[PDB]
Amino acid sequence: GMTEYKLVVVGADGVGKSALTIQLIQNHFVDEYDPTIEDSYRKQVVIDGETCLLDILDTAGSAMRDQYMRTGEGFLCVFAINNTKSFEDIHHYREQIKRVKDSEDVPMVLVGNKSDLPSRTVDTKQAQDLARSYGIPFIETSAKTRQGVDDAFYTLVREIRKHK
Ligand SMILES: Cn1cnc(Cn2ccc3ccc(CNCc4[nH]c5ccccc5c4[C@H]4NC(=O)c5ccc(O)cc54)cc32)c1
Ligand SMILES: Nc1nc2c(ncn2[C@@H]2O[C@H](COP(=O)(O)OP(=O)(O)O)[C@@H](O)[C@H]2O)c(=O)[nH]1
Ligand SMILES: [Mg+2]
């Protein structure tokens, strides 16, 4: 049948949360003003024979934050591979989400975005080590080339499906 999955994309300003979401929904990467930007996004796909209705919230980097964290079922934790501070922020997002949801098992996927860029300051191994501490998948993405974009969102749905 049909099941909705509320996904929340979190991470520092400028890592590419909006660009990743727009690549998945609108199949484009644009540097200028984009009129397709909206309050939340929707995409229907089939995963494991179930019609999955992805309902995605693209956030900014407290009452509203707590409400979207409690409402959200899965979290895409995004950093940019050429921005060490955005990677350092990840553990703070993870602890904040766990504290707000009062849960030890929160579906999450760690996303290392801007993989198309040559200016890499966070190695793949560093991100894999942080992800293994949480027992969550780590996926390298590029909203520009689409590398790993589909994988990041559907792996998060699969993590929610396993949790449920
Ligand atoms: C705030 N906002 C987001 N989209 C709209 C557009 N919109 C207008 C009516 C209308 C009805 C239905 C939906 C689908 N769900 C939107 C959505 N996707 C999420 C994915 C993950 C976590 C939270 C959401 C939500 C919001 N729902 C909530 O309870 C909530 C609480 C706090 C929020 O900051 C946002 C939401 C859009 C709607 C408004
Ligand atoms: N080269 C490259 N630029 C990206 C990528 N994702 C986002 N950007 C750019 O980085 C800037 C910030 O992106 P944005 O989606 O607004 O980040 P957000 O603040 O996390 O929502 C913009 O100039 C984007 O075009 C990516 O994968 N590769
Ligand atoms: Mg944005």
- Here the tokens at position 71 are 């409402």
- Here the tokens at position 25 are 């929904």
Nearest to 109 by CA among 73, 80, 152: 152
Q: Which residues surround ligand 3, an ion (CB under 5 A)?
A: 17-18
- Provide the domain count of the chain: 1
CATH code, domain carrying 153: 3.40.50.300
Which residues are bridge partners to 4 per DSSP?
53
Beta-sheet pairing, 138-140 with 41-47: unpaired
- CA 108/CA 137 separation, integer angstroms: 8
What b/e readout covers 23-62, taking b as 16+ CB neighbours within 10 angstroms?
bbbeeebeeeeeeeeeeebeeeeeeeeeebebbbbbbeee
**Residues near ligand 1 (Cβ within 6 A):** 6, 8, 39-40, 55, 57, 64, 67-68, 71-72
- CA 81/CA 117 separation, integer angstroms: 8
> How far is the centre of ligand 2, averaged over its atoms, from the C-alpha of 36 (Å)?
15
Going by CA atoms, what residue is nearest to atom 23 of ligand 2?
31
- CA 134/CA 129 separation, integer angstroms: 9
- Determine the number of helices (DSSP H) and then strands (DSSP E) in the chain: 5, 6
Solved how? Answer: X-ray
Residue 140 is part of which domain span? 2-163
DSSP letter, residue 49 = T
CA separation, residue 122 to residues 86, 97, 136 (Å): 10, 23, 18
- CA 122/CA 88 separation, integer angstroms: 10
- Here the tokens at position 45 are 């796909």
- CA 60/CA 10 separation, integer angstroms: 7
- Here the tokens at position 69 are 């964290």
Going by CA atoms, what residue is nearest to atom 26 of ligand 2?
114
- CA 71/CA 74 separation, integer angstroms: 9
CA separation, residue 29 to residues 32, 42, 57, 103, 156 (Å): 9, 17, 18, 35, 22
